Design an enzyme around this catalytic site. Structure first.
Site, PDB file in Angstrom:
ATOM      1  N   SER B  42       0.800  -1.218   0.000  1.00 59.84           N
ATOM      2  CA  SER B  42       0.000   0.000   0.000  1.00 59.84           C
ATOM      3  C   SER B  42       0.837   1.273   0.000  1.00 59.84           C
ATOM      4  O   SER B  42       0.263   2.361  -0.115  1.00 59.84           O
ATOM      5  CB  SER B  42      -0.946   0.004   1.200  1.00 59.84           C
ATOM      6  OG  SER B  42      -1.970  -0.962   1.037  1.00 59.84           O
ATOM      7  N   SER B 100      -5.736   3.959   3.705  1.00 62.16           N
ATOM      8  CA  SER B 100      -5.194   2.946   2.794  1.00 62.16           C
ATOM      9  C   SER B 100      -6.306   2.277   1.988  1.00 62.16           C
ATOM     10  O   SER B 100      -6.263   1.076   1.713  1.00 62.16           O
ATOM     11  CB  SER B 100      -4.366   1.905   3.549  1.00 62.16           C
ATOM     12  OG  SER B 100      -3.135   1.661   2.890  1.00 62.16           O
ATOM     13  N   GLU B 140      -4.943  -3.185  -6.911  1.00 65.52           N
ATOM     14  CA  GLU B 140      -5.352  -3.803  -5.659  1.00 65.52           C
ATOM     15  C   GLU B 140      -6.483  -4.797  -5.918  1.00 65.52           C
ATOM     16  O   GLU B 140      -7.381  -4.518  -6.717  1.00 65.52           O
ATOM     17  CB  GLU B 140      -5.808  -2.743  -4.656  1.00 65.52           C
ATOM     18  CG  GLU B 140      -4.679  -1.909  -4.071  1.00 65.52           C
ATOM     19  CD  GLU B 140      -4.186  -2.443  -2.739  1.00 65.52           C
ATOM     20  OE1 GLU B 140      -4.709  -3.482  -2.281  1.00 65.52           O
ATOM     21  OE2 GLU B 140      -3.273  -1.824  -2.150  1.00 65.52           O
ATOM     22  N   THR B 209       1.722   3.658   5.365  1.00 66.10           N
ATOM     23  CA  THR B 209       2.025   2.259   5.632  1.00 66.10           C
ATOM     24  C   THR B 209       1.702   1.371   4.433  1.00 66.10           C
ATOM     25  O   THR B 209       0.980   1.756   3.511  1.00 66.10           O
ATOM     26  CB  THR B 209       1.253   1.758   6.853  1.00 66.10           C
ATOM     27  OG1 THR B 209      -0.123   2.145   6.745  1.00 66.10           O
ATOM     28  CG2 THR B 209       1.842   2.336   8.122  1.00 66.10           C
ATOM     29  N   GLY B 210       2.255   0.162   4.467  1.00 64.65           N
ATOM     30  CA  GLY B 210       1.931  -0.874   3.508  1.00 64.65           C
ATOM     31  C   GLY B 210       1.928  -2.243   4.157  1.00 64.65           C
ATOM     32  O   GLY B 210       2.793  -2.541   4.986  1.00 64.65           O
ATOM     33  N   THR B 211       0.964  -3.085   3.795  1.00 67.26           N
ATOM     34  CA  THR B 211       0.874  -4.423   4.360  1.00 67.26           C
ATOM     35  C   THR B 211       0.324  -5.371   3.305  1.00 67.26           C
ATOM     36  O   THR B 211      -0.601  -5.021   2.569  1.00 67.26           O
ATOM     37  CB  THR B 211      -0.012  -4.450   5.613  1.00 67.26           C
ATOM     38  OG1 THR B 211       0.423  -3.439   6.529  1.00 67.26           O
ATOM     39  CG2 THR B 211       0.071  -5.803   6.299  1.00 67.26           C
TER      40      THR B 211
END
EC number: 3.5.2.6
Lengths: 265, 265, 265, 265
Positions: B42, B100, B140, B209-211
């Site tokens: 993300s 996000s 996504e 953030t990214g996950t």
């Protein structure tokens, strides 16, 4: 390594820095001018409360102590309000830790009794836990005004850290009296911009600050890692040579605390 | 130097850590697996908004975009609530950064237009800023589950840090649009336990953030020293060996951020 | 009179409001259009999970369910991501509660079996707790589009509140299965701007939202006072006059929730 | 019908509650013991800052003020730290509002000059704004411990609310100075458990607390509805019958604020 940044921080803030973190099972001991003498200042109020707790029963906290207007000599935000009401030993304990009440500290020293208004009895208590270096010779606010190089009213980051470790983490007091000391340090109101400001918010911090002339600014503290591992952090500093009126720099103490957090992480 | 603690962190969390901090005038650059490819996840939503901001005038943010229930193919905490009313380009920017929002990101890619639903247009914008390494190939939520070793939808801490530096600290955007990007990153709600948790509270932190799968957890951020000095911190990590369903460990990113903070002090 | 503000909120928002709060030992019951039928919408997903939990063992949660892309008919942010791998019953429970996954609800309805794809079996479960009013007749997303005046796929604030009370506060489920429902409802992600936005932050809120056409917006919730006293709050609303495409107004549900909080304080 | 809940709260908490909310264009005024005298406590520091701002040009805020250790006669979390350096008038305003610094309040009263160390000058400023009831007779910390029934150092919820309305919402200060008062009250750190804890989080709250002996707990505040309509909420309470050492109950002020929020919604 890490001892180079401490000298770098010493240049950028024009101060003399002292740092000691006792070694645990998993970490090595942090030292920087660890055995050089720094002024006690208000940090002696931490073992002073423990000294009153150690020799007396819990009912001693309910004893009411009266004092006069001539007894106020330094910053005493709590003692000024109760000149007519008096204060109990327990209230004097709260004031000496959370607000650095100078007059409350003098009365607690008097409660220890003996020569020098309790200074000899206090250093004697300092010898009982193995500290053969620290010494208290004057009262407030005279102990804050000692000239640089004088050995009176001084301790070292190495020495003060090991006493605080025995008092909070060790067995120098029964759980009994131990939780009273720790709770007063947790709700301290005078150290928000020192060691607490250098550690991340998810670290628990209990501390007792010290401040005097010659740019003297100290902070002894016990911190808990986010997982629960406890450490002892002793940070002391002065700016001898900048003069008697040299301003203390709290940012230096906060910056050093961030350096320590980087190592313990 | 600092790279010994980082390796001592990879073994404790069973993960691969990537850290890059661009060098300032007074400090040197921090690197650890800085040129190793990690999955975007993300984190691409931060420069994606900058690409939409860059290509259109400020009045374009008021354009209303409509979408259907089939467009919700991933976690979309804001787009799911306005399926009947639609959302403006500005609202799509807010959701993609602060929450996000996956669906909001896909619509913004469509706003860039071109081949691949806007993925080619986004990678082109990265090439204009000097990024010759990163690449976005899917949307996504396909971009999160690329197999390990695959170069699709990957960047590097070195590349993503220099991109973020131009957007927040550089002149890649005019001041009016730059302040919009910085404010959205400042009011982010998904990174409270990562770089934000590793820096002391008196440091300002803006982040994205990214996950994803394989224990992927990233955090790109711009931090400000208490005196006002800005730094760029890119932290990426995965645990691909643990499998597709391996949990990401946010504590590793917060611990690494505390190690970096100790150096910047 | 509190029933005047509810009619005032109905005028200010061009809507029809329904509120029911079951009476406790210390408080009286709040009613406003409490026995008027409103559309279930996504709020039926809360007792649906309890139906699967009640009729099946805990090991049933590990059963893997496979589905195709033709099975995805409504807003399904999670089912779209696991079309190739499939999802377990437990994940379908998580998706149906925290994200209002429409496809996960249909698959859970199929798990109840029987005629109508599980709707008759579900309403039968509603009758077991004493609810002789509510009824589910269609699947997603058809149940959200019933015309006003139609009694299909409808409940009432009175009926839905008393059902939720038995499931969270009552004994309709054993403790092991009850905690699974409460945990999913506590970590819900779709109701941040409804009942949660009307109660102060020191009140705990667990909820399950519902949204459909004709401006339909619902929120059933269990709240806890700062001292620990629990209440059940059912808030439903539609705007069956603005047309089929009438936008739902989340502010009306949040405004009504603050009115209720004023009485319980 | 709201005055019945207020009476139940007085019995629940063993206290006397005072509430006043000035009437707006669309809503009526809320009153409960609105014209009964309650102790000012620290709430006078809000109009005191406005009085200093009103009488001086903006450059006066940069004037440096020095003080001695006897000027610290009460809780002074900021003044205790800058006794060596001194503080400008602007820092005294910041400290007196955001930290309720008692010593900073005494120095600002002295800046007003005149008889009674500035108390007569302060009461005069209240008379200029139409306040014909309030009166300040002592300094800190004597004003917090006036005996019950004594009219000195008292105001009323009616009078204090109208004063705060003119300063924040009215024209008692020019915009440049008004934003300074409003900004300091928005960043208050002492009122998290009072009116702020009784209103939902999407309401903006600026406040100034007051606390003294005899269970005195006050909070004057300006709140903003989520749509942007402002209200003034004055809530005062004491428990004089319980004695000088009566604990103040912060929950009563927060609980009463929740009752008011239900009405303003």
């Amino acid at each position: 390594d890490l001892a180079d940044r401490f000298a770098e921080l010493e240049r950028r803030y024009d101060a003399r820095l002292g740092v000691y973190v006792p070694a645990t099972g998993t970490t090595a001991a942090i030292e920087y001018r660890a055995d050089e003498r720094f002024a006690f200042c208000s940090t002696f109020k931490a073992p002073l409360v423990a000294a009153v707790l150690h020799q007396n029963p819990l009912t001693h906290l309910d004893k009411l102590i009266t004092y006069t207007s001539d007894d106020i000599r330094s910053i005493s935000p709590v003692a000024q309000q109760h000149v007519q009401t008096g204060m109990t030993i327990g209230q004097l304990c709260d004031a000496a830790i959370r607000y650095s009440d100078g007059t409350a500290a003098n009365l607690l020293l008097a409660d220890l009794g003996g020569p020098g208004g309790g200074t000899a009895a206090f250093t004697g208590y300092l010898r009982s836990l193995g500290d053969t270096v620290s010494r208290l010779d004057a009262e407030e606010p005279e102990l804050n005004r000692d000239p640089p190089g004088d050995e009176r009213d001084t301790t070292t980051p190495h020495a003060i850290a090991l006493v605080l470790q025995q008092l909070v983490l060790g067995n120098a007091l029964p759980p009994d009296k131990r939780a009273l000391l720790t709770d007063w340090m947790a709700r301290n109101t005078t150290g928000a911009k020192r060691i607490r400001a250098g550690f991340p918010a998810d670290w628990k911090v209990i501390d007792k600050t010290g401040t005097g002339d010659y740019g003297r600014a100290n902070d002894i503290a016990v911190v808990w890692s986010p997982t629960g591992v406890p450490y002892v952090v002793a940070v002391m500093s002065d700016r001898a040579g900048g003069g008697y009126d040299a301003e203390p720099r709290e940012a230096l103490l906060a910056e050093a605390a961030t350096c320590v957090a980087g190592v313990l992480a």
